[PDB]
Amino acid sequence: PQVELFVKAGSDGAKIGNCPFSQRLFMVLWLKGVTFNVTTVDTKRRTETVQKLCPGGQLPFLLYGTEVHTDTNKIEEFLEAVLCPPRYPKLAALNPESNTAGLDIFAKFSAYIKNSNPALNDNLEKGLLKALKVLDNYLTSPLPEEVDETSAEDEGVSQRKFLDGNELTLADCNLLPKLHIVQVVCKKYRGFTIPEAFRGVFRYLSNAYAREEFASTCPDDEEIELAYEQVAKALK
C-alpha cells in the first residue's frame, strides 16, 4: 500500500530543505521498515500533482494509499497506529517522560538566535544551556529497565544510548532533528557549541550520528545554515 511523504525542498528547489518536521517523519518511516518514498516540494514552483493532492499547501504531508494526511503530530500518530506488530515495530517510547525531556530546547534556541539585542545575549545563552542541562539530567538518570545495575566508578548513572532505552523511539524522531538545527546554526553564527561536559547529551548525539536513520535524513549543513541566515545575522 503506497506510502508517499512530501517534504519541503531546499535552495535548489530539489534537495531536502530545512524542516525538523520533514526529518522527523522521514525518520519514523525509515525506522518502521516500511517501503515508502519521498518527494521534495519547491513551494515556489508546485507541481500540478501536489496542488491536486494537497490544495491547502501544508508541508510535510503524507499520501497513504489514496488519502492525504497533514499535521506532523497527527501523521506520526497515524503511522504508529497503522504500521504495527508483527509486521512493523512499535516505536512509541515506554516511559512517558522520554516524550517530554528536551522539548523546550528548540524555543530557547529560537529566542537565542533571533535576538539582535546584545544586552540579552548572555541571558538567552544561559537559558539555552539550562534547557540542555535538563535534557542531560534525563539522559543520565537510570530508566526502570536499568534498575539496580551499576559500575562502581559510575553508580546511579545511565548507560543507555537513546532517550527511552537502547532503541530509537518516536521521542528521538521528534527531538533529534531539532537538536541538529540547534547545533548547526549556533556553531555557524554564535560561536556556540553544546558543552562536551553534558556527557549525557554528548553520548546521545554521538550515538544518533552513528545511526543511518538520523544521519541520512539530515538536510545538508548548508541548507540549515541558509535557512537561518536572515534571522541569525541580525545580532551585531
Curated annotation (Swiss-Prot):
- How does its record describe regulation of its activity? The oxidoreductase activity is inhibited by rapamycin, amphotericin B and IAA-94. The channel conductance is regulated by pH and redox membrane potential. Inhibited by IAA-94.
Q: What general EC class does the enzyme of this chain belong to?
A: oxidoreductase
UniProt key word Nucleotide-binding: no
Task: Give residue ranges for domain GST C-terminal.
Answer: 88-228
Question: According to the UniProt entry, which residues carry N6-acetyllysine?
Answer: K8, K114, K126
- Record membrane topology: Single-pass membrane protein
In the record, biological process GO terms are: chloride transport; platelet aggregation; positive regulation of osteoblast differentiation; regulation of mitochondrial membrane potential; signal transduction
* Residues bearing PTM Phosphoserine: S116, S151, S206
Motif segment (G-site): 19-22
EC number(s)?
A: 1.8.-.-, 1.8.5.1
Q: What is the effect of changing C54A?
A: Loss of glutathione-dependent oxidoreductase activity
User: What are the UniProt keywords, alphabetically?
Assistant: Acetylation, Cell membrane, Chloride, Chloride channel, Cytoplasm, Disulfide bond, Endoplasmic reticulum, Glutathionylation, Ion channel, Ion transport, Membrane, Nucleus, Oxidoreductase, Phosphoprotein, Transmembrane, Transmembrane helix, Transport, Voltage-gated channel
Reported pH dependence: Optimally active at neutral to slightly alkaline pH.
Give TM regions: 21-41
Which residues does this entry mark as bearing S-glutathionyl cysteine?
C19
Q: Which catalytic reaction applies to this protein?
A: L-dehydroascorbate + 2 glutathione = glutathione disulfide + L-ascorbate; chloride(in) = chloride(out); iodide(out) = iodide(in); thiocyanate(in) = thiocyanate(out)
Disulphide connectivity of cysteines? C19-C54
Q: In which tissues is it expressed?
A: Expression is prominent in heart, placenta, liver, kidney and pancreas.
Consequence the record notes for mutating C54S: Loss of dimerization and of ion transport activity
**One Pfam family linked to the record:** CLIC-like_N
Q: Which residues bind glutathione?
A: C19, L59, T72
Question: Additional comments on file?
Answer: The protein seems to have very low affinity for glutathione, even though glutathione binding was observed in protein crystals.
Subunit (UniProt):
Monomer. Homodimer (in vitro). Interacts with TRAPPC2. Dimerization requires a conformation change that leads to the exposure of a large hydrophobic surface. In vivo, this may lead to membrane insertion. Interacts with AKAP9.
UniProt domain comment: The active G-site contains a monothiol Cys-X-X-Ser motif which mediates glutathione-dependent redox catalysis. Members of this family may change from a globular, soluble state to a state where the N-terminal domain is inserted into the membrane and functions as a channel. The redox status of the active cysteine in Cys-X-X-Cys/Ser motif likely determines the capacity to adopt a soluble or membrane-inserted state. A conformation change of the N-terminal domain is thought to expose hydrophobic surfaces that trigger membrane insertion.
How is this protein named in the record? Chloride intracellular channel protein 1
Q: What is the source species? A: Homo sapiens
The encoding gene:
CLIC1
